[PDB]
User: Which sequence fits this backbone?
């Protein structure tokens, strides 16, 4: 997989650049970087192929380039029709592809809003049922795209994580939730856990500890 | 030999140049050609080898009587953003016979749609730039190669 | 360039197999490379593999190595993708995509299908309702968040009220997460004055009609 920011945004007319980080065996090795525009429901659409070339019919306000192991896609004069998910992809060297995680591109209809984060440890009831769940609630952020990461004593946790897609609140801001599922022994064998929410380059971290 | 080994700039492998040093690789066979490739592709500069470099760029015959020299030039041939001035041939309709050079840039037609000299979604520019970076793994770093025939 | 036509939506159960068709719609796949790409709910695009309609060269992603089979009948010009022993996290939209290419589509895929939704459904499961107790450090002047975790039910929907609907202000019910197990979980939190923690009772009311279940969970201070 390639690495992409979760959210890129701008007001109508501005220029937005989405970066995409790969390795020297894909992005660094080839000029086969393709950017796909996607709206869930419809099929992906090629916007840039090669690294910088535009298929016919794609507006010239889309441009692409790369440097070392980092490719990038820039949209000039942002229009509402450009709001979508964008996936970088590359030839990976052995008749295969590698995709990025996707970036939601938002045409800012209101000012940015940083998220509020609330973290709940497992209830004693659930531990009595031989289960454990940390609950991370994220609300009031804009635009509606975040990255959630879980850590246990600085060690990244990627097993047992479930995260919603953001959903719009009544106030046009967005909410989301993440859940970390542990066994009670797992929950007790660490000294602290944390939920980390990244939104437009800014991070909020909440921490719970079994002995506090 | 100084005009070769001690040259400022080296050629790309697709456009390779023709023209006691024992005191990275000094493998001799049975006992001058200049270009730059990445370190992992140096093994293809030997008789009977296959790969993108051996088959599309520089080919040595199995009857080779000579010496293949190489040294790490990452310090010289890498830029932090990538040195895209060094390239190799990614596509070709056939392999080169021994000691043949190909400097063409005709668009490679990979599908049924003709190219008519234009790069397209299935119409490839046949040369691929290396983009050498100084922090690349040493197998991906550039190596200057001199083949004595 | 959406032009390929794919088979209708599929509803399968864990452990079954599925086969998606992709008809060329007027082309001849003899000069087409075919790729398959899936998207699971709330996730990104995922390349599954590719087959050459010209000479049959196939490659699969390491994730699906041994589980997927791609074939083409250029007689009817139809591509096929079989995925064996479905798990609940195989629930996704599956796209076939093509390009005019006798070898690998190095630039990716030009022509696309409309997608085929494949749902691996679960057995109906009642939820487990757990309290998320307010902070043990809540003092009179402050506000306190307390909630209900509704874990591992199937299918949607679930309704949550507080004090039988008497309490509406400050309530936030988060939309459920579709976990990789195929089950849903959601949370509902209300923000209250901490001064009321010792005098006021807070009860969430969870209704899950598909499993004919109702839970009333009192959330007490830590
Ligand atoms: C390159 O230059 C150094 C010193 O300038 C010299 O010792 C060396 O022999 C030269 N190499 C060749 C091949 O002449
Ligand atoms: C597709 O092309 C092949 C090869 O010429 C041919 O045998 C086959 O009948 C064609 N099918 C259709 C539907 O055109």
Assistant:
């Amino acid at each position: 997989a390639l690495t992409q920011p979760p959210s890129a945004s701008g007001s109508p007319g501005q220029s937005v650049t989405i970066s995409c980080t790969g390795t020297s065996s894909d992005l660094g090795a080839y000029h086969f970087v393709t950017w796909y525009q996607h709206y869930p429901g419809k099929a992906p659409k090629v916007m840039i192929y090669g690294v910088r070339k535009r298929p016919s019919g794609v507006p010239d306000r889309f441009s692409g380039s790369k440097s070392g192991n980092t490719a990038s896609l820039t949209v000039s004069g942002l229009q509402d029709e450009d709001e979508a998910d964008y996936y970088c992809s590359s030839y990976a060297g052995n008749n295969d592809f590698v995709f990025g995680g996707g970036t939601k591109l938002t045409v800012l209809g209101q000012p940015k809003a940083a998220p509020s984060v609330t973290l709940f440890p497992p209830s004693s009831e659930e531990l009595q049922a031989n289960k454990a769940t940390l609950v991370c609630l994220i609300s009031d952020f804009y635009p509606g795209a975040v990255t959630v990461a879980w850590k246990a004593d600085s060690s990244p946790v990627k097993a047992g994580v479930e995260t919603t897609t953001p959903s719009k609140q009544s106030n046009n801001k967005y909410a989301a939730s993440s859940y970390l599922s542990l066994t009670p022994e797992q929950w007790k064998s660490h000294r602290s856990y944390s939920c980390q929410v990244t939104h437009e380059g800014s991070t909020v971290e909440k921490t719970v500890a079994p002995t506090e | 030999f100084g005009e070769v080994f001690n040259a400022t700039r080296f050629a790309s492998v697709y456009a390779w140049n023709r023209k006691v040093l024992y005191n990275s690789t000094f493998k001799c066979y049975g006992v001058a050609d200049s270009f730059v490739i990445r370190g992992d592709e140096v093994r293809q500069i030997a008789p009977g080898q296959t790969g993108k470099i051996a088959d599309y760029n520089y080919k040595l015959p199995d009857d080779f009587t000579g010496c293949v020299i190489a040294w790490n030039s990452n310090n010289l041939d890498s830029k932090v953003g990538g040195n895209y001035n060094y390239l190799y041939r990614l596509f070709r309709k056939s392999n080169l016979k021994p000691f043949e050079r190909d400097i063409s840039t005709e668009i490679y037609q990979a599908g049924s749609t003709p190219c008519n000299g234009v790069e397209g979604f299935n119409c490839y520019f046949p040369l691929q730039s290396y983009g050498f970076q100084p922090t690349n793994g040493v197998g991906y770093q550039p190596y200057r190669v001199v083949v004595l025939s | 360039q959406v032009q390929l036509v794919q088979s209708e939506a599929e509803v399968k159960e864990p452990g079954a197999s599925v086969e998606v068709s992709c008809k060329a719609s007027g082309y001849n796949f003899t000069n087409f490379a075919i790729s398959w790409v899936r998207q699971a709910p709330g996730q990104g695009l995922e390349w599954m593999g590719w087959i050459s309609g010209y000479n049959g060269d196939t490659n699969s992603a390491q994730k699906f190595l041994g589980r997927v089979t791609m074939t083409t009948d250029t007689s009817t010009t139809t591509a096929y993708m079989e995925l064996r022993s479905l798990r609940s996290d195989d629930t996704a939209v599956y796209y076939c995509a093509g390009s005019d290419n006798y070898g690998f589509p190095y630039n990716g895929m030009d022509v696309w299908g409309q997608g085929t939704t494949v749902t691996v459904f679960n057995q109906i499961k009642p939820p487990s309702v757990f309290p998320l107790a307010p902070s043990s450090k809540s003092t009179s002047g402050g506000t306190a968040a307390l909630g209900c975790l509704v874990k591992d039910y199937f299918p949607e929907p679930v309704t949550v009220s507080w004090n039988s609907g008497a309490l509406t202000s400050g309530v936030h019910t988060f939309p459920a997460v579709l976990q990789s197990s195929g089950l849903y979980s959601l949370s509902s939190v209300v923000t209250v004055p901490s001064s009321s923690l010792g005098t006021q009772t807070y009860i969430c009311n969870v209704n899950h009609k598909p499993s004919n279940t109702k839970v009333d969970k009192k959330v007490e201070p830590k």
Notes: The longest strand of chain C covers residues 143-153. The interface with chain B takes residues 31, 99-103, 105-107, 110 of chain C (CB under 8 Å). The two ends of chain C are 58 Å apart (CA to CA).
